[model samples]
Each structure stands twice: as C-alpha cells, then as structure tokens.
Target: EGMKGAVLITGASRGIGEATARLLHAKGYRVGLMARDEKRLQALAAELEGALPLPGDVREEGDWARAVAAMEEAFGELSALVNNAGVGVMKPVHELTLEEWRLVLDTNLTGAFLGIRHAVPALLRRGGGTIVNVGSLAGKNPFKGGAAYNASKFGLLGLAGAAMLDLREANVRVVNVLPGSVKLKPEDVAQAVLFALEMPGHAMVSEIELRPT
Candidate 1:
C-alpha cells in the first residue's frame, strides 16, 4: 500500500510510547508523538525523521486537538492511534483522596476518550484504521491499594470495547492490548499494535494480552 498513512501514539516520549513510535517510523509509518514533556518530545522528533512531536497533557482537551492538528499538518492522513498513555494514583479505597482519584481517572480513562474522539475523524477520513489502547491486567485483577488506578483501567477497557463496536463501520478497529506483569517498554505494546494495523480487512485481532517473560 506504499506506507499509506501516519500513526499517533500518546505518552510517547521515552517509555513504551517512544519505543512504539520509533518502531513504526522505522517500519515506514509516518509517526507523531504526544506527551507532556516538550524536551523529550523535541529530542525524539529530531532523532526520527518524518516524526512530529506535540507536547501536551492528556488531561487537557485542547491537547489532543493540537496533537491531531500537528500530525495532520505534517502528513495528510492518520491510519493508526495508540492510546497508551496513563497515570497511577495508588491508595487504598478508603484512604484515597478525591484529588488523587481524579488525577488517575482523568488521565488514564477520560484522556483516552478525548484522544479517540479527536482521532476518529482522521481514521474515518482515511476510510479505516486501527486503534490500540494499552490496558493493564490490573483492570482484570484488582490490587488492594489500587482503587483509583484500577477503576481507570477498567473504564478504559470498557471504552475500548464500545469503541470497537462503534467504529466497525469505518473499518476503524479498536482493540485493547492487555498487559500482565509485563515489562513496560513501548514495544511491549507496540509489537501487537503494529501487527494489528497490517492485517487484511477480513482479519481482525480484537484484543491481545502480553504476559510476563
């Protein structure tokens, strides 16, 4: 298909997102990175040719918009979205502060919703695309001191499920890549993501899980 698209990855400064961006760029997908760290984003952009960096907080609605705009200006269309950015606020259910709870839930879940909302247009314009949301196995197995964080992940998993059904007509496949006690390198999620986007129209790998090595 002549590398016919671009990819947008969130939290892509140094961890899993960064690794995914590099891997995809190397594989010939024009890539865009979003995160709150400007210095890191700029440096990564400089390092990867044809990659654009948009520095913004996922908690901010305007941030996702700006990111998409930047990517659109750089490349005409977006073919994939990686909703891999998240935050943690670990506290016992009774001990959790509202502020801490908001911090985690807003970024981990609401943030991705905004991202998907902003990105759906791009994917639709291209006639189709794949979205991979990185979710923790924690969403399935609750930990004692993870009230806010656990709720956020569980919500995100739900988002991925409905988003998958909603975007079916657009060929915009939405899948949640579950991670279980696994390493956090960007490629840990990226490999499954890349594989998803390259599949044929008839084949859909809905969700995949990464286990501890």
Candidate 2:
C-alpha cells in the first residue's frame, strides 16, 4: 500500500504494457493506461478500478504531454512512468526499408525519450520517482536479421544509461530492464518493472538483466 502511487504506462493496450498496468493497479497504484488503441485501453480501464485510459501515439510529443497532464489531473501526481511501447521490424540490413527503420527507432527509442522528457518534471514534482524502460536482450546481442530492431534496442540502452546519470542526483531513478529470450511472457517483464520501482528510495536498481532459466 505504501508503494501505491500514480503510474503512467505507455503501450498499455497489450503485452508487457498491459501486464504492467494490471500488476501496478493490483498493487494499489493508480494507473494511467496509454496506447494507440483507444478501444482496448478503455476496456482495460473499465476492468480496473482507478485506472485511466489515455489513448495516444507514443511517437508524438504532444500525446506524451497530454497523457502526463491527464494523469496528474486524474491521480494528483505521477510517481512513475513505464516506457513500454515498442515496435520491431526484423530484417537484414539490405532488406530493411527506410520507413521500417524509422518506425522501429521512433517507437522503441525516441518514444521512450519523449516519455522521459514529459514524465521527469511530474516525477520531480512528487519529490522523486522512477522511470522504467522495457528493453530487450537484443540491445546487446545482434543477429543477422535484427538490424532495425537491434539498433533501436541498443540505442535504448544508451539512452537509459545516460538518463540514469542525469536524473539520479534529482532523486528520479531511471531503470532499464533487458530481458532475454526464453519463452518469456509480458507478465515476467511486468514483474521486473514493479521490482525496480519497489526498491527502497536510497537504493536505485539502475539496470536489471532478466534471463530465462
């Protein structure tokens, strides 16, 4: 109950984002569910008490601003932001199109950047909070057909690392969770997100590498 606070999760319509929303809400946190799919977001919100549906595109800067404001308006203050929206286009370098490349980078990398930019101020207003980035093991391991996906994830790692350094002094902790392939479920990653946020204020779990046994 003590960790219960306001949390905004991007890509909350399904997968890891949705699971995180459910887990956080179950933990007594007020959740703001954001995704491009308004119908699904609304449905999820309806199912969970104290959950707000914020339908928007993560690739757009304005949407991030609107979602943050809406969360604050509905829940009072934002305690954490989960950058869980991600798109992947797996293809060899020669086969990857410019559009596909941009989509991957914009969603997986830049989207998280925008979320952080908008959420930091709100987190600061609350005195300090957490920013959880749902990343992949592809961030460090490259494969033949993973050009765009790999690059985007790798970029995410760099982004989270630098952000951690910049926000730590301000009491805002930036956590990057990299999960390896092993029949993993979205709930597994969701649990990791909660774990990072539940750490004691003085201890910042900057990074978590989740691998399947």
Candidate 3:
C-alpha cells in the first residue's frame, strides 16, 4: 500500500545496479534494491525514503521469494523489475574455482531466472509492467577467459527474448538491455529502463543494449 508505480532492481548494492536504482528513485519511481549486503540496502533505502530495501541473495529461490513478497506488501503494485544482480569473473576454465564458476552462473544467470519467475505474476496483477535485464558485450563476443561469464550473458539474451514473447501478450514488457565494453553506470541500464518502463502500455520494447562510451 505504498506506491502504485514501482521498480525492483537487483545487484543494487553497487555498480550499474546502484546507478539504475538512484536514477529511478530520483525520477519519482518507488525503487526496490536487492543484494547480499543489508547495510548498503539500508543506506540506499534511507536515501530514497520511498525506496524499498530488500536484502537477500539472488541465488537462493527463497531469497527471491522473500523479496517479491515484501515488494507487493510494501508497494502494492510494481511497474518494473531490473535483473541486474550478477558478478563478472575473469579466469580460464582450468584455473577457475568451483565457487568462482558458481558465483558467475548462479548470480548472473539463475538470479535473473528467479527474478522473472516471481515478477510475472505481479506484473499481470498490476495491469502489466516492464522487466529490464542487463547483459555484457562479453555475452555476444566471448573473450579468452570468459567461459562462464560469456555463457551466462548469452543465456541472458535468450531469456530476455523468451520473456518478451511470453509476457508481452499479457501486457508485460520484457527487455534485455545489453551493454558493450565501456565504463558502465547503473544509469546506462536505468536510461534504457526509463525509456521502456515509461512507455504507454500499448507499446513494448523487446530488447535494448547499451554501449555508452
């Protein structure tokens, strides 16, 4: 019962996710930031008094469960979901630790899967909403030490596409905002979100990739 138009951003503790959250919060959007760091989430929540702080791991299904539940409870309705919770690791397959590999796969890929899984129902009930997922150029152009990282990015594109098809008809907008090699701020992703999120419910953007230089 807080706000009607709201956004949920993952990996919001820092980097592009943080930037996106700030931009949305400033633009009169009630924002929800999810991350493993509770302190950072609390600080950001305080900064945006209307912003909702959801401290949880994107990996565990229960974490997402706790989050979306809190989101609906706090805001009543959601307008956007940013699946930006992921980590980037550089390493060869042979040298990469199992934990390192899992960190990238679980955080980058699986996290988004759950993000969408939970958001879809909410979007349907809210009369539709937008979903923005962040991906790297590394997803399309695989580098020397980007096995797991690249795999996850490639998968993100596929998920975004499929999500678009599956949700758009329901009036839910799904977009994959891919980013090229450049210093990425959450604004890079946030701008894309604002564009797609603010569109008339009659319109929908399938995907958007950012190459901010």
Candidate 4:
C-alpha cells in the first residue's frame, strides 16, 4: 500500500538482476522475476516469499506483454520495472559477426525498449512508477574490443534519457545506472537501484554512474 510496492525485474536469474530481486524482496516488495532461464528463476522465486517467476525472452514483444500481464495478475499492479538483462560479445568490429552484433543490440537495447513499451501502461495505471536501466560504463567509454557491447550500452543511455523526458511528466521516473569495471559487484549495483527507488516521490535521480576508486 506504500513504498513496498510490486516490481518487475528482467534478467532476474543471475548477476545484477538477481541481486536487485533479492534486495527488493528482502525489503518487502512483491517481485516479478523475469528471465529466459525458467529453472533458475523458479529456484530464486521459491526462495523469496511472494516472488513470481516469469520466464521469457526479453527480445520478444509478446514476452514483455505476457510479463506485464502476469505481474499485474500476481501482484495487483506494477510499481517499477528494471531492464537489467544484458549480454556482451567482446570482439573488434571487423571480427564481430552480424549475428553477434544483433544479439547484443536485441538483448540490451531493444529488450529495454520493449519492456518500457509494455510496462509503462501498467505504471501509468498505478499513478506513477520507476524504470531502471542497468547500463555500463562501456556505454560512455568504448574499448578496443567492445564494438557490439559498447554500441548496445551507448544506445541504452540514449533510450533511458529520451524515455525519462517522455515519462517524467506522467510521474514515471526513468533512471540509468552505469557501472565501471573496477571492483563493481552485482550487489553494489543492486544498492544503487534501491537508492533510486527509495527516493521520495517528489524527487527523481535521473542517472547514476558507479566509478570505483
């Protein structure tokens, strides 16, 4: 009824997504865990009370629709969505195949777009909500062998920025968190997410960059 609202997180089976799911659930939110790995999602769901396992491909529009529908059905309404599913194929531009490039772009950028398209309506219905994108420092600074990964993450920042402007008027906060390479753990990123979500409704923290010293 209050801040402990329902949240849907993609890539909830592992890495940063898994950590965010765990943290949110521990803090008393009903979480919808979305990912392609049904077994892992199921295992995590069983461990967390009131957690729903939503196994589906992030790149599919229908899957996003199904996920939003399932979240509304299980939790009554969606208060936040975390677009955390990502994959990186490290190779030079010349060596990277078209398929590899597509895989990274589809999963990281398009996946977030689809989730937003589907989840925004649900968030609007709830009066307001949050959308968090788990981008990387690679989004801003490209490396020699990070063509596809860099492109996907860079596009994510653009997506998040545009969406933030578009949805902020509706009371939906869109935030992007970019984590650098040095000593950044999944749990640390998860904490950043909690910080964004727990902020007072009147304030919006648009972006966070994790730079390890």
Candidate 5:
C-alpha cells in the first residue's frame, strides 16, 4: 500500500501539474497538490485518493513552508517535489514591465528555489528524494516576444543543473523536463516526470527534452 511514497506538486490546479498529480495518484503515490486556486486544488484532491490539497502561492517562502509541512503531515514522508508553477509574459525586453519580469522569474525560477529549500530537509530525513522542474523550449530557443519567459525557463535549467550537483551525493536527484511545444497533452510531460521517478535509485536523469512532432 505504501509503495509509491509521497509527492508534492506545485501549480497542480491545472495543466501539466494537474496531469502529473492524476498520473502519480494512479501510480499509488500519496500526492500533495499545491496551486494558487484553492477551489480547484481542493476539487482535484477530493477526486484523487491519497491526495492532499495544499493551496498556496509558489512565489512565497511562507507558503512553501506551509505546503511542505502540510504534505509531510498528511503522507508521513516527502519523496518527490515537482516544481511546475509558471507563467507566460510574452513581450520584448523594451516592452516589458519590471513587474512582468519579476512575475515570470519569481514563478518559474525562484519558486523552484523556494520549493527545494523547504522540501530538501524532509527528503534528507527520508534518506532520498526526487526534484523535477518543468521547463520549456523557450529556455533553449529565445524568441522575439519571449524575453521574460525565456529568461525564466533558462534560469530553470541552471537551477536544475546546480541543484543536481548539490543533492546527488545526498541521494536526491534533480531533473529538468523541457517540452519543445505545449501542443501535446499535458500528460506527456507528466510521463517524463514519471520516467525519472521510476528509475533505479542509483541512476539519474539530469535533463529530458520532449519535442512534439
């Protein structure tokens, strides 16, 4: 009954995070769902067995702390943390507001940092963990109106790389799943995350790039 362990997924109210939550729950993981929309988070949690609704903003440190604590309390251990909160601010650098830039960076990049910060200790206590960051093609291929988004995603790659290096020795694996196009079903990315999760503990999938044909 406890084979799947525990997972905390941010931005789980909809899209890729929601898809991952469903897939993980079906796979028998005790899942903690976090998102800004409390209503949707609650609804999704209610629909999935062993899923806990953790409504919070990813950009806030306190929110991350609370989310991590709530999940630990519900499931008894945190074996995986999925940093999937993100936003699109498609604008040329000159046309972008500071607020817009901050929003994208905070949500995409810093939010991951906050999750890792709060989640790592619990994982360490559990003896190991997996951290999956959802990234984009924009990070690798910068486009005209994608300055903010590109920067945020690009930062995610760096975050993942450094984090992997930081945590691997401690039995924590960090991986980045970068999707080339958002045209496919969100579960595509979730499957990638599941792939990383299901691997043998000694192996590490540092980065996986998913391209839609």
Candidate 6:
C-alpha cells in the first residue's frame, strides 16, 4: 500500500480526534495523538499501531511546538493536522465568569490557531497537506448559554477561511467542517475528513456544513 503519510491529531484521547486517528491509521497513515491525557493517549496508540502519543496541553504554544516537532521526527513530514481539541463552557453572557470564558476560548480557538501555526511549516515542507478544523453549528446558530463556545467556533470558521486563502497557493488546503444540530457520532466527522483529504488535488472544499438528512 502506498503510504498515505502521517497526521497529527489534537484532542485525540477521546471523541472525534480518537475516532479520526483510528480511521486514518487503519487507512495507512502514521498518526500522532496530542492531548493532556498521557495514559489515555498511550493506550490509544497501542491499539492503533504506529500511532505516537504526544501528551500536552493545547493551550500552550511550547507544547504545540514540541508535539509537531516530535511527530515530524517520528513519522517523517506530517501530511495533515486535525485541530479537533475543544472545550465548551455553558453560561449566559451576563453570568459567564472570566475564567470560564477564557478556558473555552483558549482550548477551542487558540489551540486550533497554535496547531495551524506550528503545523503549517511542516505542511509546507512536504510541499502540500491538509488542515481540518472541526467547528460546530453553534457558530451559525447562537444560543443564550453557548456564548463562549459559539464565539470560539465562529472564530474558527473565519480562521479556516483566511488560512485557506493564505496557504492555497502553496498546495496546503484548509477546511472548516461545521457539523449540524444532530449529535454527530465521532465516525461521522472522521468520514468528512477522509472526504476532504481524498479529493483531487486540483480542487478544495473550503467550508462545509454537514448535517444528517
């Protein structure tokens, strides 16, 4: 099998990140898992075969730098990055505490930004790659208690769009996948990433809102 190259995934201990890592690894991609949960990541790495655990906090730039470097060292150059790590703090705008707001923004938006910043060099080094940022319907349909989460997702969409423009000429594709209101199974999001990554190199899907019909 021709190697599909490697991918570094954040929030990979559970949920969408874990599912994506498993699917991609099965499809022949070497995977690097990043999250604060060292034990869980190690366990997942063992199950996925060829998956490496890079435990760290997404909120830290130093962590992002080290994780990306370690992935490149182990897997050769990274071909994709799945910025799936996120946290949600639910509270009315008026009642939201500063810490709560910062926690959500730091994990969801800032983390993705750092991933992009750190991973772009590697993508460019390979002459092309993919960046997938997982967003939510909350970005488009804001709710009373979803202030922090919604804002982060909304900003993520903007970041993806702008990043697409910035990196398109270099053959790196940036995609924002906004899953809709239905509770999406982790595999659903994984498939979306597969679709985006498997597309012909001549075309790129910039942003998509996925929903069950």
Question: Highest lDDT among the candidates is held by which one?
Answer: 4
lDDT of each: 0.83, 0.89, 0.81, 0.90, 0.88, 0.87
Clashes of 1: 1
The superposed Cα distance between candidate 6 and the true structure at residue 65, in angstroms, equals 0.5
As for TM-score, the candidate ahead, 2 or 3, is 2
Which pairs in model 2 have colliding backbones?
Answer: none
Task: Find the number of clashing residue pairs for candidate 5.
Answer: 0
Of the two candidates 5 and 6, the one with more favorable lDDT, higher being better, is 5
State how far residue 195 of model 4 sits from its true place (Å): 1.5
Task: State the lDDT of candidate 6 residue by residue for 39-116, as single tens digits.
Answer: 999899889777889999999999999998998898788899999998888978989999999999999998988999
In candidate 3, how many Å is residue 115 off?
0.7
Give lDDT: candidate 5, residue 165. 93
Stretches of candidate 6 above 4 Å error? 181-183
Note the clash tally of each candidate.
1, 0, 1, 0, 0, 0
lDDT value for model 4:
0.90
| Model 4: lDDT of residue 85 | 92
Q: Compute the lDDT for candidate 1.
A: 0.83
Per residue, candidate 2 scores C-alpha lDDT tens digits across 1-213 of 644899999989999999999998998889999998899998999999879999998899999999999999988899999998988778779988999999999988999999999999999898998999998878888888899888988998899989999999999999888776547788888999999888777766788878765
User: What's the lDDT for residue 160 in model 1?
Assistant: 85
- Regions of model 1 farther than 4 Å from truth: 1-4, 180-185
lDDT of 5 by residue, 1-213 (tens): 667878999989999999999999998888999998999988998899678988888999999998888888887878999998988888679999999989999988999999999999999999988998888777788789998898888888888889999999999989888776546679999999899888885566788888766
Per-residue lDDT over 149-213 for candidate 3, one digit per residue giving the tens place of the 0 to 100 score: 99888888887778788877788777777776546666667787777677755555677767657
Q: How high is the lDDT of residue 69 in model 3?
A: 78
